[PDB]
Design an enzyme around this catalytic site. Sequence first.
Site, PDB file in Angstrom:
ATOM      1  CG  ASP A   1      -4.921  15.973   7.848  1.00 43.60           C
ATOM      2  OD1 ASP A   1      -4.072  15.057   7.844  1.00 43.60           O
ATOM      3  OD2 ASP A   1      -4.812  17.012   7.156  1.00 43.60           O
TER       4      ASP A   1
ATOM      5  CB  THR B   1      -1.168  -0.057   1.012  1.00 44.07           C
ATOM      6  OG1 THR B   1      -2.038  -1.129   0.653  1.00 44.07           O
ATOM      7  CG2 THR B   1      -1.967   1.241   1.078  1.00 44.07           C
ATOM      8  N   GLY B   2       1.596   1.533   1.068  1.00 38.47           N
ATOM      9  CA  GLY B   2       2.436   2.715   1.220  1.00 38.47           C
ATOM     10  C   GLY B   2       2.932   2.937   2.634  1.00 38.47           C
ATOM     11  N   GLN B   3       4.222   3.303   2.765  1.00 38.26           N
ATOM     12  CA  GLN B   3       4.882   3.577   4.043  1.00 38.26           C
ATOM     13  C   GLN B   3       5.973   4.656   3.890  1.00 38.26           C
ATOM     14  N   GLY B   4       5.841   5.784   4.591  1.00 38.52           N
ATOM     15  CA  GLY B   4       4.742   6.084   5.503  1.00 38.52           C
ATOM     16  C   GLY B   4       3.633   6.901   4.865  1.00 38.52           C
ATOM     17  CB  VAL B   5       4.462  10.334   5.874  1.00 35.90           C
TER      18      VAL B   5
ATOM     19  CB  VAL C   1      -1.359   1.533   5.744  1.00 36.53           C
ATOM     20  CG1 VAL C   1      -2.702   0.829   5.558  1.00 36.53           C
ATOM     21  CG2 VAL C   1      -1.501   2.691   6.731  1.00 36.53           C
TER      22      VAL C   1
HETATM   23  N1  LIG Z   1      -8.645   0.780   5.905  1.00 33.78           N
HETATM   24  C1  LIG Z   1      -7.815   0.900   4.879  1.00 33.78           C
HETATM   25  N2  LIG Z   1      -7.921   0.059   3.831  1.00 33.78           N
HETATM   26  C2  LIG Z   1      -7.093   0.151   2.796  1.00 33.78           C
HETATM   27  N3  LIG Z   1      -6.145   1.082   2.748  1.00 33.78           N
HETATM   28  C3  LIG Z   1      -5.989   1.955   3.763  1.00 33.78           C
HETATM   29  C4  LIG Z   1      -6.828   1.884   4.865  1.00 33.78           C
HETATM   30  N4  LIG Z   1      -6.459   2.847   5.705  1.00 33.78           N
HETATM   31  C5  LIG Z   1      -5.432   3.500   5.156  1.00 33.78           C
HETATM   32  N5  LIG Z   1      -5.141   2.955   3.972  1.00 33.78           N
HETATM   33  C6  LIG Z   1      -4.076   3.389   3.028  1.00 33.78           C
HETATM   34  O1  LIG Z   1      -2.895   3.924   3.692  1.00 33.78           O
HETATM   35  C7  LIG Z   1      -2.786   5.340   3.358  1.00 33.78           C
HETATM   36  C8  LIG Z   1      -2.232   6.143   4.549  1.00 33.78           C
HETATM   37  O2  LIG Z   1      -2.901   5.794   5.767  1.00 33.78           O
HETATM   38  P1  LIG Z   1      -2.944   6.822   7.004  1.00 33.78           P
HETATM   39  O3  LIG Z   1      -4.071   6.543   7.922  1.00 33.78           O
HETATM   40  O4  LIG Z   1      -3.045   8.294   6.348  1.00 33.78           O
HETATM   41  O5  LIG Z   1      -1.496   6.693   7.718  1.00 33.78           O
HETATM   42  P2  LIG Z   1      -0.730   7.993   8.277  1.00 33.78           P
HETATM   43  O6  LIG Z   1      -1.540   8.831   9.181  1.00 33.78           O
HETATM   44  O7  LIG Z   1       0.592   7.490   8.995  1.00 33.78           O
HETATM   45  O8  LIG Z   1      -0.230   8.782   6.977  1.00 33.78           O
HETATM   46  C9  LIG Z   1      -4.201   5.757   2.958  1.00 33.78           C
HETATM   47  O9  LIG Z   1      -4.176   6.907   2.101  1.00 33.78           O
HETATM   48  C10 LIG Z   1      -4.653   4.529   2.185  1.00 33.78           C
HETATM   49  O10 LIG Z   1      -4.055   4.515   0.882  1.00 33.78           O
END
Ligand SMILES: Nc1ncnc2c1ncn2[C@@H]1O[C@H](COP(=O)(O)OP(=O)(O)O)[C@@H](O)[C@H]1O
Length: 328
Positions: free
Chosen positions: A148, A26-30, A34
């Site tokens: 946010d 998915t993506g890390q971080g920031v 996740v």
């Molecule tokens: N419940 C979820 N299901 C699938 N992907 C998710 C979910 N929650 C978050 N993500 C993915 O991870 C990304 C970042 O999550 P986030 O809550 O913003 O972490 P952070 O606050 O550290 O940046 C989201 O934009 C989305 O792409």
Amino acid sequence: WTDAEGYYRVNIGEVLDKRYNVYGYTGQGVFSNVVRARDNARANQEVAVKIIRNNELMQKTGLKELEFLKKLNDADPDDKFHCLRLFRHFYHKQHLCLVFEPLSMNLREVLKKYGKDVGLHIKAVRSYSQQLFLALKLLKRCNILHADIKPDNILVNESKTILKLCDFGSASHVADNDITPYLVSRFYRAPEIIIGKSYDYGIDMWSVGCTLYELYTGKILFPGKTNNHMLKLAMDLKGKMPNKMIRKGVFKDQHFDQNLNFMYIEREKVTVMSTINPTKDLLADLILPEDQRKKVHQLKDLLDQILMLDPAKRISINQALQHAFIQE
Ligand SMILES: Nc1ncnc2c1ncn2[C@@H]1O[C@H](COP(=O)(O)OP(=O)(O)O)[C@@H](O)[C@H]1O
């Protein structure tokens, strides 16, 4: 196992809490990792695992995110107020891990897939606005401020019919209300935050309005470089900020002088403006069939009520849900 910044790194194929088999990234971080996992204990069902950053301050926000999501989930047992569903939580190699419902992608990702300055169809924006206002209703029912609301923090399902408000890492209680002008992501930041005026649920309403314009146009409403540039762009549509609102603020002197005139910064450069005229045409920037055009005018009327500079003159959640744009 843990980085200097506080990241876990993650391994593909690793089993978390003896049940969650990590397959996706998915993506890390920031600020957290996740990952996409399959729950072997629940017939290999899809789940999203948010691995909270280590250190000291990040774990504090993680537990804060845990308590706020538990409150919203308990207040909405039937899941009708479009907020992210937290399944459970566990600890893995020092990090706090939050188990969430599986979602396809965020609204910033769908906008990129729609094209450069294209935006979503008016029918999708209409459905998305109603769900966003329903999320604000639950946020106001509880004593929580998301702080946010942006396309990046709004996740959508696989069919893109249902959205969920996510990322409660910067969320706060109404009674707390800290005196800070850097609250909310800059482009979606309410004018009362910048000026230093007392803020409530209105900041989340303002952010929703900023997102709704972006959802239809594919462009950021106010792409301000600084807090002072954000006020100028906000005043370019609504005119000069009312005198009664400026006086209530804390950071008045940073943007307005003793004669209550705006000081626009453009090598410092300061230009004093007595009266700001509404130059931005919301209708021209928003806009072909007559059934779609009528809905665009209704969105414009809704946006003018949401984008009111004074939060006391801002449209309520109930009136926004009852608006001609939603009700058709
Ligand atoms: N419940 C979820 N299901 C699938 N992907 C998710 C979910 N929650 C978050 N993500 C993915 O991870 C990304 C970042 O999550 P986030 O809550 O913003 O972490 P952070 O606050 O550290 O940046 C989201 O934009 C989305 O792409």
